[PDB]
Write a protein that binds this DNA or RNA. Structure first.
Length: 88
DNA sequence: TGCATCCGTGAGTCGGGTAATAACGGCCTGTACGCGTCCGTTTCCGGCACCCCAAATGAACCGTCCCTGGCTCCAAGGTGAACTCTGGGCGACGAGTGTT
């Protein structure tokens, strides 16, 4: 929003925003690397037909990306239950 | 600095075809198909303006392809006689033969 129709942002008001942006992206990454184990545990079951183990794993990884992007913590549910549907 | 440890080529010649998984509503659209209507086309019914067109209806008609007329000038049918066989008619002569 500040890019066009903004203000000459001072350093105190710019560096903090940049830092929190990087922090959020890093936290997202961290959750993904945490839950790849759930991804592989789910994808182990669909083997033996069509495509290979690693292809299934990477498709589950894409599904996990989608699940994290569309997750909602306010609902007070464990993340695994929501992510399983998207992985599948 | 060997040294095991893979590691990369053989090794010839002309009956067919064999299987798995949670997935389920709900919205969009898109290309193909299915309705109703209108207009160019086109194609013929019968009309001329007449275009005339013509095979069919009167002549001659003249050469010619048929009739009738007379005339021969001859070669075939009718009129002879003989004759050389053609055939019958006449006659004599001779042995194989009916008989006591």
């Amino acid at each position: 929003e500040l890019s066009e129709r903004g203000e000459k942002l001072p350093a105190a008001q710019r560096r903090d925003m940049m830092w929190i942006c990087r922090d959020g992206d890093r936290a997202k990454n961290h959750l993904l690397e945490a839950n790849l184990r759930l991804v592989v545990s789910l994808a182990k079951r669909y083997t033996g037909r069509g495509m290979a183990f690693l292809d299934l794993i990477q498709e589950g990884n894409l599904g996990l990306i989608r699940a994290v992007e569309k997750f909602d913590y306010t609902k007070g549910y464990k993340f695994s239950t929501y992510a399983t549907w998207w992985i599948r």
